[PDB]
RNA sequence: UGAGGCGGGGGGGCGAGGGCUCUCGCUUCUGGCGCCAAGCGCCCGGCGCCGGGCGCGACCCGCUCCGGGGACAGU
RNA sequence: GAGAUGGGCGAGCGCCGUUCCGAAGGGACGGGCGAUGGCCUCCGUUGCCCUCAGCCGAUCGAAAGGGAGUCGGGUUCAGA
């Protein structure tokens, strides 16, 4: 519907009950969930291998 | 006892790692059009070779003797509009049924009586906008044998009278008790200004480079001198 | 007074004291606007000779005019 | 005193109010658009009378610088009726014609006689 | 007596550029603290087409380290860049295609494009369709660099000015022969009124 | 360029022969996220209860906003 | 596209130019303070102090560009 009509129609017609609902497509929302977790997990793998480096050096 | 929920969360402000906090930025502020003009005029008072007849206005009298001289000058303040009014009602009441020595403000009062040699001490302001209005006067009282001292700021010198600014104040005569109070000052002042006239003439002012250039030229003076030292052995 | 002492100084424009101080204001005015107000005369001896009386009602404007 | 932004914003100076020693003009000018100047005269048209029986309205010739709100209060306070709506138009000759639909509990056919038009 | 056609073009008002559908100023990112000392990471959002430029444009998007806001620039694309490719920006960045860095940190003979001719002017040199510049020789004393330009003219320039790596996309455009006068007409109708040339 | 960290002097990690020479003050596989101080210490105000501040965090010093030309372009 | 201000130029009417050599926001958020009203309740309103701000250039420019929201029946010598 036309964007000036968006004042008329209520909240439930203008989004979907979800994180990023109404602003992002779910197919690339789960791909944002998968992306956000794997990166922070791999980021922890960075710290652990940097914990052995200065003990032997 | 302590809540274990309190987690320490430091922030690594590394390059491309975290947003910068609101630190100081006073050295990179785009200053107004009038302030940027206002500051680099002090730079040009250090860059160029300042001629010594106006370089003699950074060669100013110290802290503690400025206290006593104004204390000596806090006793000869001029009659105000009230102290004239309370003077004139005192002379008009004696009409029905000599002046003490007071100061002289302004150059037009001073430069006359120095030519008549009536002055015993001259007080000078150093930061007049047309510096040409004062520049002759130190080189004049040297030829008139009148002791002169320069004071930093015209406003604190401007409060001897109840006006804004005063360029020159004269001590023409004093009270009987205020004789040894100045005779030690002239003996401490003329050993800075009048008898040391010749040495001020050969001391130009400014001729200073920048701390980003004296860091540059000296660093090549340090890299060259550290070469030639080990060339002998 | 001291005005005559200032009078013969301003006739010494080639001297080093004037050659400096002239180039300061010339640099200073060149960073300003083309038409603006000065609070007090920078050249007071030439002011009163031309009729300037220092009182309320006398306002002076310092401008820059293109050479050539 | 630490500057956060490198662009220096002009300080928000205090401003005073207008506390004049004297009013610029002497007296408040009389409004020349009072209740009588707005209502010049009604009409006598063979097409205006047919407008009165059917639609229950009144026709007028109103001053050109008036608005629909001022027409609604002018009829309301000079002939003492209440108004449902007012429809204006500007005639070719220049003055502003106004159809005045009154409150539906009144009959303008009677009120045409108190203002005289028949 | 009359004003010649070549004289009228300096006045403009007809021969001025047709700048309606053009995207914007195809510049480099400006210099700053992060680009001066380290490197900064970027994201190429999309590759748009600028009318009147036979070379394409790319929408690179940055993350400012001073205020929480998302910055977008218009880089001149290097052939090989794809959407979603972390392009790096700074002096501490490495050497691959679509990765801008000051010349003095690079080794010799490197093919680059979209080059500056002064430090920090957001690039001027070698930014047509499919041209490049080659770093001929550095000079660690006084920080100077000899660089070749796509005309055959070798140029001395400083070491702080920077350039993306790789050729500009759309190389070899002039190999296609425009055959009918309309394609040239439709070419120059996106730049300026200059196409029908009268001998 | 919204003029956002310029230059010295200090603080530590990479390294051979307890300072000295210096690299360096932290970010690279990936279409995610990042502002509106945690933490820590120390003052003050009020009925153990709620609410303010200073300094660290986030060195210090400075005079030219960074740069590039330059007594030559230019007028 | 047109066209003010700052600025620049011009003997001068003026012209230049529209982010460019500019202190270009008269805005709020909450907080503290001081006050005012209607059941000075609670909220509304004004003043000071503290804190916040990327805007981007005054303005004009379309009765075919953009632009929420009305239709059926009946009515006049002429209006829907």
UniProtKB/Swiss-Prot annotation, chain B:
The keyword Repeat does not apply. The keyword Ribosomal protein applies. GO terms for molecular function: RNA binding. It comes from the Eukaryota. GO terms for cellular component: cytoplasm; ribonucleoprotein complex; ribosome. Keywords: Acetylation, Cytoplasm, Isopeptide bond, Ribonucleoprotein, Ribosomal protein, Ubl conjugation. Transmembrane segments: none annotated. It is found in: Cytoplasm. Coiled coil: none annotated. Component of the large ribosomal subunit. The ribosome is a large ribonucleoprotein complex responsible for the synthesis of proteins in the cell. Belongs to the eukaryotic ribosomal protein eL8 family. This is Large ribosomal subunit protein eL8. It comes from Oryctolagus cuniculus (Rabbit). The lineage of its organism: Eukaryota, Metazoa, Chordata, Craniata, Vertebrata. The gene is RPL7A. The chain holds residues 80 to 319 of 319 of the full protein.
Swiss-Prot record, chain C:
It is found in: Cytoplasm. The modification Phosphoserine is found at residue 33. A lipid is attached at residue 1 (N-myristoyl glycine). It comes from the Eukaryota. Component of the large ribosomal subunit. The ribosome is a large ribonucleoprotein complex responsible for the synthesis of proteins in the cell. Belongs to the eukaryotic ribosomal protein eL15 family. Component of the large ribosomal subunit. Interacts with IFIT1 (via TPR repeats 1-4). This is Large ribosomal subunit protein eL15. It comes from Oryctolagus cuniculus (Rabbit). The gene is RPL15.
UniProtKB/Swiss-Prot annotation, chain D:
One of its GO terms (molecular function) is structural constituent of ribosome. Component of the large ribosomal subunit. The ribosome is a large ribonucleoprotein complex responsible for the synthesis of proteins in the cell. Binds a specific region on the 26S rRNA. May promote p53/TP53 degradation possibly through the stimulation of MDM2-mediated TP53 polyubiquitination. This is Large ribosomal subunit protein uL23. Keywords: Acetylation, Citrullination, Cytoplasm, Isopeptide bond, Methylation, Nucleus, Phosphoprotein, Ribonucleoprotein, Ribosomal protein, RNA-binding, rRNA-binding, Ubl conjugation. The chain holds residues 39 to 156 of 156 of the full protein. N-terminus is methylated by METTL11A/NTM1. It is found in: Cytoplasm; Nucleus. It comes from Oryctolagus cuniculus (Rabbit). GO terms for cellular component: cytosolic ribosome; nucleus; ribosomal subunit.
UniProtKB/Swiss-Prot annotation, chain E:
One of its GO terms (cellular component) is cytosolic large ribosomal subunit. Keywords: Cytoplasm, Hydroxylation, Isopeptide bond, Ribonucleoprotein, Ribosomal protein, RNA-binding, rRNA-binding, Ubl conjugation. Component of the large ribosomal subunit. The ribosome is a large ribonucleoprotein complex responsible for the synthesis of proteins in the cell. There is a cross-link at residues 41, 148 (Glycyl lysine isopeptide (Lys-Gly) (interchain with G-Cter in SUMO2)). Belongs to the universal ribosomal protein uL2 family. The gene is RPL8. This is Large ribosomal subunit protein uL2. Component of the large ribosomal subunit. Interacts with CRY1. The modification is impaired by hypoxia. GO terms for biological process: cytoplasmic translation. GO terms for molecular function: rRNA binding; structural constituent of ribosome. It is found in: Cytoplasm.
